[PDB]
Amino acid sequence: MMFWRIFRLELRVAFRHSAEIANPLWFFLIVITLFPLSIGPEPQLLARIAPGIIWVAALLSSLLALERLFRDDLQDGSLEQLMLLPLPLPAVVLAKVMAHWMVTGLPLLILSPLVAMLLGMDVYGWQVMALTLLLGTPTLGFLGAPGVALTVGLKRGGVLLSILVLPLTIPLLIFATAAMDAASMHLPVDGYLAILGALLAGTATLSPFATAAALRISIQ
Amino acid sequence: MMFWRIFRLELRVAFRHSAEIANPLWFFLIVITLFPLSIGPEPQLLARIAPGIIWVAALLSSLLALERLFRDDLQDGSLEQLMLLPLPLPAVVLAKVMAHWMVTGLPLLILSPLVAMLLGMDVYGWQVMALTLLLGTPTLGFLGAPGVALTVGLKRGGVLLSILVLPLTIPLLIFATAAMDAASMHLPVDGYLAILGALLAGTATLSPFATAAALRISIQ
Amino acid sequence: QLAIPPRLYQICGWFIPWLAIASVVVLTVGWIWGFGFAPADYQQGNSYRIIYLHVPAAIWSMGIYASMAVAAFIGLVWQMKMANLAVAAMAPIGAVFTFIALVTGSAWGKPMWGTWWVWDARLTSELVLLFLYVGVIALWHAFDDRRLAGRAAGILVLIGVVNLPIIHYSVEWWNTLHQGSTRMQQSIDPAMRSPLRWSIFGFLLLSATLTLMRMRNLILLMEKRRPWVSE
Amino acid sequence: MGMLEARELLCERDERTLFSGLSFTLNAGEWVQITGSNGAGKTTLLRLLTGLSRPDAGEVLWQGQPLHQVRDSYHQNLLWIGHQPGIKTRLTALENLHFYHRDGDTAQCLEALAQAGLAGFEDIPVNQLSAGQQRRVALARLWLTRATLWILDEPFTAIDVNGVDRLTQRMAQHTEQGGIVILTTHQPLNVAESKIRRISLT
Amino acid sequence: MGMLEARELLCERDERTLFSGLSFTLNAGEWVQITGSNGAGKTTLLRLLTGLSRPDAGEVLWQGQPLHQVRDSYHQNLLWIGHQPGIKTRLTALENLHFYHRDGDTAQCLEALAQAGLAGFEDIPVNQLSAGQQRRVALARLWLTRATLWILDEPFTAIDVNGVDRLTQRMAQHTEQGGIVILTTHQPLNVAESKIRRISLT
Amino acid sequence: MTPAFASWNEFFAMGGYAFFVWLAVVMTVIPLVVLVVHSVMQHRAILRGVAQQRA
Ligand code: HEM
Ligand SMILES: Nc1ncnc2c1ncn2[C@@H]1O[C@H](COP(=O)(O)OP(=O)(O)OP(=O)(O)O)[C@@H](O)[C@H]1O
Ligand SMILES: [Mg+2]
């Protein structure tokens, strides 16, 4: 109830001080800088391997931040939402997922101008990387929300349970890499962005429903 | 009370903790598969970027595997070793971190031959693979133990750990990837091997004392 | 004959005016005697004037990291409570110095490389030092309970300083493997030495100012509940 | 006709069924307490009444209609605090209640805190409360909420007797007006027996 | 005489002063219990006795020596069971306690646990055992340890009186030979009142 | 008494590479003043921070 005050709540719980907001920024920066230490300093090498670097960093951030989205609540705050808030469970879980993005995607997007200069990306490359990144990163919380809830709240879970979390994100990253490679080659990519645009408008509609049902089943 | 007793019991409780130890392994597999799939059919660049991608994969897998090192100890059994076992605490930490390597580092070692087939390395390449991984992963665990020892009290498993120890692992990454690059050029790598061994020996002594002090502080 | 009581709050109060005004005077004399009263090199042209503004930041980054090392070393073995507090006082000052050195080095290198980013030993090392800083700040801000952030922070500082020369010599050696050497040798020239040293001293003294204010703030934040703070 | 009604509830854990065929209807103005003990059915009996879990065989109808069918007119009249109060430990006591309250006008929030024994603990983070005041924050809602239903588990698990006493006398108060009170207490209640209707897991 | 003794011990947490300048002799042949309220720092006190926590000021001496100096031989004579049991949950009972056996294991384990009341549960992992029985496995170390110091932190949380009396006898049959049982409890001990030397957080 | 510039901002503020040097000056002055004002203001807030605690 009052979607935005929930939003303010999970804004407050995750962050404690004005100094510690940029923690995901520092994670992104160290993950990116790990590669030129190992791959090499040559720009052309680092130029062409940009998509893997950037979306691997995004994948790491998403996986690290999804565990905290649900596992901690099991001990203390998993309920009081399935049990209160007469508003539909899809609404509150959508709030959780979108704030999960806005504490991870927003730092990554706002950091994109810097990282593109580290890897030698050009303005067109930065533009396509930013527009795809803002178009695909929110989805990472969408499909990951049902998977993480089961793996952190279902006991006697086998190895096959994690297959609904990590490998389901492969299509997103492969389309992202292919699209921004095509853009890096200086080609129009609008059709690829439409595919990303199509999946974002579609997954956002069905993700909260399945996630709410998954939490309902998992708490029992 | 003896090194071997704590070693074997930590190993045993590691065997009982299946299905999350594979998560570093599954992550390693997926990350080493993205980049060859990210770049189309052109092997010369793949040979050039193979050591970097696989070693950053090794770093990330080490962090994910090390995240559990002290997680399930503070609530139950971080003590009973500071408090009991008249054997000095640094020895206990040393035994437990060797067990952690044995349950985590060794699976990486046995996973190399499949990786080499995928990445098209040669027999000398796999030889140096094993040599650097066998002398790199123990350094990873030894250097990562202080970070988890410090952050165990927080019980915030995630971004914070990944920025406290990962910047410490830079020289290991540089020397490992440089050795593996030089190996593909068929130059002798004995001096690089000696440098890696010296780094492991140096971190073999400071890390136990540092983690002992860190745990003694974190309990309070 | 150390006392180290909360009375050190008064000690900090007894230094801020004098030392701060001395710092502002020396900085302004360095930056007017530099940045407009000294010539430049033949090659880089007038852009060489970044030296007065770029080198001291880098130098004092390492200087106050050494200060971190000594303060934490005192605070751990002797169990000095305030000595462990010095870490948090100098942490964001270090972060700012190293960030400034990074941005200047990148900005100074634009004419000679043509690009805003060059992965050289000098810049890359500064990135790792900044990372050690931001790790220290993050660790200190992670602890809700004080009196712990400063002991764990001290241990982190010790781990950093032990590994710092290894990392720096590795990255210096890493650069040799790819490019081979630096651009050109180091020539300060007698006509361009005194202003640089005076700017070094000015950054020293402004760092001292900021450390003292942060010590005072941390003293208040820690001993916030004792009736000593009734004022 | 009337609010929540049990309808041959059946549930089971492991090998022992906690109860069998509960069907009891409750109307307005009842203070009631579950007897027996709390081994497994502690949360089980209450969660099924709230619709949090689905029954192995049975159902409960709120106001004559299925709980999951509406899911709206039932949640609006309900409060619950149990083994885990469901309030986040990060926030302070004052702000944590503000979201829970329907608007958080702040003109009465501190009043609830004051009447809950949490005088002056408004701006302190709730994690800094020593051992029991955290439940007091959750129990502070009951001064402000307009809901007519209360499902509560261990409401006096660590509450002091004076704190317990204030909580009890407020429960009987609204039951006189329109309310209902169900409690699962190991500590005996210091109230007249006729004001409590008791039932166990059978 | 005087193997356990603290010097002007005091600790400060936030605004509240738990205690100031604690100092008291603790020699062999005593049976010691700690009194206090649920907000008092009794748990903080006990953990401080075992050297896990560095005191805010003051110190404790083992036999007259600072604990960190004699930390090696100190762990020879001490047994500690806190609020957290300290036992591996996914590891079975018989082999969990097997760690704490210097010798005579795999056969002497059974006798002690059966007295605690875990006969027939030697080869079951902890996570399929009840919490009350779960505590007993940790307490089973009492019959087997040769340590002179038994430090129990609320060892009667959910333990049956038949177990409690059996446990109480165990620490009643240990101190007279020279043993020491530093205890904290909320149940009124059902033993001779002169056997308890009470200390409060003064 | 010996300037290094023949004249003022007609010659000054344009060293040929003025764009690089001047952005460096601003991007260095900002962090120092931000730290100073942050420390002083946060100290001042603590000083008020006592006040509402005394109520
Ligand atoms: C272009 C980017 C540059 C960056 C990022 C940079 C950074 C640094 C760093 C990290 C130091 C510390 C060295 C030490 O403490 O031993 C330093 C000092 C110094 N730099 Fe640079 N520098 C740059 C350009 C240059 C150039 C082109 C020269 C040419 C001579 C130069 C000359 C010096 C000298 C003489 C020192 C003093 C060495 C010392 O104090 O030990 N710098 N600078
Ligand atoms: N991190 C902390 N954890 C626990 N107590 C703290 C902490 N920081 C400060 N304190 C204060 O120190 C005191 C220590 O009390 P302690 O935790 O020993 O209570 P306790 O007797 O263990 O409670 P219980 O009997 O319910 O376990 C508390 O009153 C608390 O207010
Ligand atoms: Mg306690």
Residue numbers in the entry:
A (entry chain B), B (entry chain F): 1 to 220
C (entry chain C): 7 to 237
D (entry chain A), E (entry chain E): -1 to 200
F (entry chain D): 1 to 55
Please give the exact wording used by the authors of the publication that reports this structure:
The cytochrome c maturation system I, consisting of eight membrane proteins (CcmABCDEFGH), results in the attachment of heme to cysteine residues of cytochrome c proteins. CcmABCD represents an ABC transporter complex using the energy of ATP hydrolysis for the transfer of heme from one binding partner (CcmC) to another (CcmE). Our cryo-EM structures reveal that CcmA2B2 form a homodimer which is an ABC transporter analog. CcmC which harbors the heme-binding site is attached to two CcmBs with two coupling helices TM4 and TM5 on CcmC, respectively.
